[PDB]
Design a protein around this ligand. Sequence first.
Ligand SMILES: [Mg+2]
Ligand SMILES: [Mg+2]
Ligand SMILES: [Mg+2]
Ligand SMILES: [Mg+2]
Ligand SMILES: [Mg+2]
Ligand SMILES: [Mg+2]
Ligand SMILES: [Mg+2]
Ligand SMILES: [Mg+2]
Ligand SMILES: [Mg+2]
Ligand SMILES: [Mg+2]
Ligand SMILES: [Mg+2]
Ligand SMILES: [Mg+2]
Ligand SMILES: [Mg+2]
Ligand SMILES: [Mg+2]
Ligand SMILES: [Mg+2]
Ligand SMILES: [Mg+2]
Ligand SMILES: [Mg+2]
Ligand SMILES: [Mg+2]
Ligand SMILES: [Mg+2]
Ligand SMILES: [Mg+2]
Ligand SMILES: [Mg+2]
Ligand SMILES: [Mg+2]
Ligand SMILES: [Mg+2]
Ligand SMILES: [Mg+2]
Ligand SMILES: [Mg+2]
Ligand SMILES: [Mg+2]
Ligand SMILES: [Mg+2]
Ligand SMILES: [Mg+2]
Ligand SMILES: [Mg+2]
Ligand SMILES: [Mg+2]
Ligand SMILES: [Mg+2]
Ligand SMILES: [Mg+2]
Ligand SMILES: [Mg+2]
Ligand SMILES: [Mg+2]
Ligand SMILES: [Mg+2]
Ligand SMILES: [Mg+2]
Ligand SMILES: [Mg+2]
Ligand SMILES: [Mg+2]
Ligand SMILES: [Mg+2]
Ligand SMILES: [Mg+2]
Ligand SMILES: [Mg+2]
Ligand SMILES: [Mg+2]
Ligand SMILES: [Mg+2]
Ligand SMILES: [Mg+2]
Ligand SMILES: [Mg+2]
Ligand SMILES: [Mg+2]
Ligand SMILES: [Mg+2]
Ligand SMILES: [Mg+2]
Ligand SMILES: [Mg+2]
Ligand SMILES: [Mg+2]
Ligand SMILES: [Mg+2]
Ligand SMILES: [Mg+2]
Ligand SMILES: [Mg+2]
Ligand SMILES: [Mg+2]
Ligand SMILES: [Mg+2]
Ligand SMILES: [Mg+2]
Ligand SMILES: [Mg+2]
Ligand SMILES: [Mg+2]
Ligand SMILES: [Mg+2]
Ligand SMILES: [Mg+2]
Ligand SMILES: [Mg+2]
Ligand SMILES: [Mg+2]
Ligand SMILES: [Mg+2]
Ligand SMILES: [Mg+2]
Ligand SMILES: [Mg+2]
Lengths: 54, 100, 146, 62, 23
Amino acid sequence: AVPKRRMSRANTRSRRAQWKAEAPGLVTVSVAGQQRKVPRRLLKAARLGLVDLD
Amino acid sequence: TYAIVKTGGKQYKVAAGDVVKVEKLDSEPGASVSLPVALVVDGANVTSKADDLAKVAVTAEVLEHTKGPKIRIHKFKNKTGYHKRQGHRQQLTVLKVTGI
Amino acid sequence: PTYTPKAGDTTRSWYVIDASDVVLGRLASAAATLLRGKHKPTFTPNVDGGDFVIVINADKIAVSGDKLTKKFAYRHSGYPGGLRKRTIGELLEKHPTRVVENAIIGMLPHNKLGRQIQKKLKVYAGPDHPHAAQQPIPFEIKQVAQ
Amino acid sequence: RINAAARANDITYNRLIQGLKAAGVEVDRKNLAELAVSDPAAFTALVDVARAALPEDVNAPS
Amino acid sequence: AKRGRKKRDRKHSKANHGKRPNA
RNA sequence: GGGAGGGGAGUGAAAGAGUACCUGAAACCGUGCGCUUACAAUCCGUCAGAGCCCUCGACGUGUCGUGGGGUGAUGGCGUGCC
RNA sequence: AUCAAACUCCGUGAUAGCUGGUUCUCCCCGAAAUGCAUUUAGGUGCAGCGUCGCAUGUUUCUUGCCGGAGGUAGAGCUACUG
RNA sequence: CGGGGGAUAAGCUCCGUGCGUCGAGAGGGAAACAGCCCAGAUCGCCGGCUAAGGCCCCUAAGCGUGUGCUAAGUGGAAAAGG
RNA sequence: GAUUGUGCGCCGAUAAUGUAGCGGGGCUCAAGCACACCGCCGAAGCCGCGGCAGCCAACGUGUUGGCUGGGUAGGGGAGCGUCCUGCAUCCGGUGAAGCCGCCGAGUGAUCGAGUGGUGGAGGGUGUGGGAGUGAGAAUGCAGGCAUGAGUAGCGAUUAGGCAA
RNA sequence: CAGGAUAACCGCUGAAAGCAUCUAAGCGGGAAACCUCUUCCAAGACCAGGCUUCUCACCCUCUAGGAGGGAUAAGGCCCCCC
Ligand SMILES: [Mg+2]
Ligand SMILES: [Mg+2]
Ligand SMILES: [Mg+2]
Ligand SMILES: [Mg+2]
Ligand SMILES: [Mg+2]
Ligand SMILES: [Mg+2]
Ligand SMILES: [Mg+2]
Ligand SMILES: [Mg+2]
Ligand SMILES: [Mg+2]
Ligand SMILES: [Mg+2]
Ligand SMILES: [Mg+2]
Ligand SMILES: [Mg+2]
Ligand SMILES: [Mg+2]
Ligand SMILES: [Mg+2]
Ligand SMILES: [Mg+2]
Ligand SMILES: [Mg+2]
Ligand SMILES: [Mg+2]
Ligand SMILES: [Mg+2]
Ligand SMILES: [Mg+2]
Ligand SMILES: [Mg+2]
Ligand SMILES: [Mg+2]
Ligand SMILES: [Mg+2]
Ligand SMILES: [Mg+2]
Ligand SMILES: [Mg+2]
Ligand SMILES: [Mg+2]
Ligand SMILES: [Mg+2]
Ligand SMILES: [Mg+2]
Ligand SMILES: [Mg+2]
Ligand SMILES: [Mg+2]
Ligand SMILES: [Mg+2]
Ligand SMILES: [Mg+2]
Ligand SMILES: [Mg+2]
Ligand SMILES: [Mg+2]
Ligand SMILES: [Mg+2]
Ligand SMILES: [Mg+2]
Ligand SMILES: [Mg+2]
Ligand SMILES: [Mg+2]
Ligand SMILES: [Mg+2]
Ligand SMILES: [Mg+2]
Ligand SMILES: [Mg+2]
Ligand SMILES: [Mg+2]
Ligand SMILES: [Mg+2]
Ligand SMILES: [Mg+2]
Ligand SMILES: [Mg+2]
Ligand SMILES: [Mg+2]
Ligand SMILES: [Mg+2]
Ligand SMILES: [Mg+2]
Ligand SMILES: [Mg+2]
Ligand SMILES: [Mg+2]
Ligand SMILES: [Mg+2]
Ligand SMILES: [Mg+2]
Ligand SMILES: [Mg+2]
Ligand SMILES: [Mg+2]
Ligand SMILES: [Mg+2]
Ligand SMILES: [Mg+2]
Ligand SMILES: [Mg+2]
Ligand SMILES: [Mg+2]
Ligand SMILES: [Mg+2]
Ligand SMILES: [Mg+2]
Ligand SMILES: [Mg+2]
Ligand SMILES: [Mg+2]
Ligand SMILES: [Mg+2]
Ligand SMILES: [Mg+2]
Ligand SMILES: [Mg+2]
Ligand SMILES: [Mg+2]
């Protein structure tokens, strides 16, 4: 089918707001003498140096 | 000590040394005008007899002439094509009571 | 201009009304008028000016006629064929206060002002009440001769 | 407001207005209301005046 | 039917003096 | 900084004139600031109407005044246009 | 890509008793859905009903009184037809 | 209101009425309801007096006064008959 | 005991979504019905005060007085705004034209030679003449932009994986 | 199953109305019909229920009226193997 009427601006914005993204957590890891932040999901990779860091 | 004054077919409660908005009455600014009386309250005594009320008098001083807020009028009916426009403003006078 | 109520000029009070051998209509009318505060000379429709009320001994309410079995209080849950009914006698037997609460609720405006107002009422069944620490003032229904 | 004040002062609004009319005092409902909210003593005095001015029997065929 | 009887009967209110549009 | 693109310093009256370059409105999308709303049945306005905030005077710490502005808790009324 | 008579330019702004739309303001006055006629009934001509002006201007309307003819309501039948 | 067509049916149709209203008419009254009752909007006023209808609360005004009826929620749906 | 006439009454009573045939709460300690009496609320009606307009009389070179002031189609009269022009004038790189505010003003279409920011090159008043001279709707047209929407799909019948 | 109050019906005591009558005062029996009794949901039931255990303490700022910000305990959450 099809919609009948143009919804209100307030309704549109209210429905739109919930659509977003969430930031992940960070952890401190020390490699080669300096501290840099990486997600906990990559702790072992960072420790063993298998992940490149810019 | 306060009394009641009749003016322009209506009444306003007023005490000594007060200012009220009253409908325009022919009088040169700066002069004094006498007004009738309606009721008098003094302490615990109340004067209500018509003869005493008539005998008592009110004196006040006219300050200036002022015009009220503007108001816009429209007439409208549905499915007629009738549209009417009309503006209007009212004239007011500001006075200060002197003694009663 | 006409007088209007300020932020903190309002004052409330505590009232108690007995319900021993009294007619429900009169009791409800008195309660409604007291809740609304029509008696107080500081009435203004937009802001409540009501006064607290206490009702005691609801079970002794007297009702005339055969209403004990010919008057029915209805309500419906919402699903199809869910309209079930109860009689005033059973209502008094089970929940003494429900009848008076419903009567007073119906005796008041149904807007949200009245919705907030109905908070002002407390109704009890026994002859006692734990609200004795606030010194309620006894009240009596009277007629002004004219 | 006037009805509430009169009922508090133990007299009906209709009889109060009848007494005012009989006494021939022409003050207006706004004045009575403002006075009642402001001067209960004055309101009581006016009510007493009206009651005194009331006729003997309100039920008489006159 | 029931619908018809109502409006004609409701016309007998003393407010309208008994005469109303559409019976 | 890969570029695209941008910041200083200069050109010039202006760079609110930077080849997408006069004057730059409305639909449209914004960031910051002030007020209000999570027990509510509204052709979404009006008449009343507390609180809060901004302001103009006189008087002092805030209180009135022939004072203005924005917000509006709450009551009455209310069946779009051709 | 369309056929109970293809497509393009012109006659050509083909023609409709038919459906649709026609915008800035105020002051004064203020209608009908009736009769007659019509290859006529959802069309249209005339009359009545409105407005502006010109001319005679109470000739308009209500009440009282007076002079007037009707054949209904009712009622009646050896007064006629049943 | 007085009539015809109709099954003495329709919110049906066709007539006549110095007849009312709506149509081209806001307010108040009957919950809502153009055609019913009162009442004809030049504009402003935080003034008085009233028609129709109302005066337990919703909702402004009398749980008015005096004399009588009601046992049926008749009040707040209708006939032959008992 | 019966027939007589009267005011109230009872039975006769039964359709489909949820009491639903007093508006609700509720009312026979009538707030139900009949007859008298006294009062009150109740509009844009009338009265009171004031502003404007039309017709008419009086006297006057506009004061007073008497009536009226709703309208669809329709008739008559009187007006605002925009452009180009004849004539006579004034403003302007010491800032002219539009745009966005504040403050005000006329009974209307609106006005401000009163003030603030942007801009840079022509404008206003008075009295005549001529208008392509005034938008909301015709399933109107040219250009730009809203929702469904960050939803469906990403166009087969084989299928990729690994080291560099 | 069992219990409570009922419709149709069956009754006991009884004047109005010396008798009689299940009635106008009262008292009783009487069904898959109604209320508890079976299973499940349920304190957003705004009267927002009830009984228990755990911590019940560290700062800064605006200006001391409250509020805001930072650091903690009880607990909870994120990520991980299922
Ligand atoms: Mg009929
Ligand atoms: Mg330069
Ligand atoms: Mg461009
Ligand atoms: Mg540009
Ligand atoms: Mg809230
Ligand atoms: Mg509602
Ligand atoms: Mg409304
Ligand atoms: Mg409504
Ligand atoms: Mg052919
Ligand atoms: Mg071809
Ligand atoms: Mg030709
Ligand atoms: Mg051609
Ligand atoms: Mg053609
Ligand atoms: Mg043609
Ligand atoms: Mg059409
Ligand atoms: Mg006319
Ligand atoms: Mg004809
Ligand atoms: Mg004559
Ligand atoms: Mg004759
Ligand atoms: Mg006959
Ligand atoms: Mg014969
Ligand atoms: Mg007839
Ligand atoms: Mg007939
Ligand atoms: Mg017809
Ligand atoms: Mg006809
Ligand atoms: Mg009319
Ligand atoms: Mg009307
Ligand atoms: Mg109405
Ligand atoms: Mg008028
Ligand atoms: Mg009156
Ligand atoms: Mg009357
Ligand atoms: Mg009242
Ligand atoms: Mg009564
Ligand atoms: Mg009697
Ligand atoms: Mg009935
Ligand atoms: Mg009958
Ligand atoms: Mg019979
Ligand atoms: Mg009889
Ligand atoms: Mg019955
Ligand atoms: Mg009712
Ligand atoms: Mg009038
Ligand atoms: Mg005139
Ligand atoms: Mg007019
Ligand atoms: Mg027209
Ligand atoms: Mg016209
Ligand atoms: Mg111009
Ligand atoms: Mg030009
Ligand atoms: Mg020059
Ligand atoms: Mg310049
Ligand atoms: Mg400049
Ligand atoms: Mg410039
Ligand atoms: Mg000229
Ligand atoms: Mg011209
Ligand atoms: Mg010409
Ligand atoms: Mg043109
Ligand atoms: Mg347009
Ligand atoms: Mg388009
Ligand atoms: Mg879309
Ligand atoms: Mg999808
Ligand atoms: Mg998909
Ligand atoms: Mg493909
Ligand atoms: Mg017996
Ligand atoms: Mg017996
Ligand atoms: Mg809770
Ligand atoms: Mg934890």
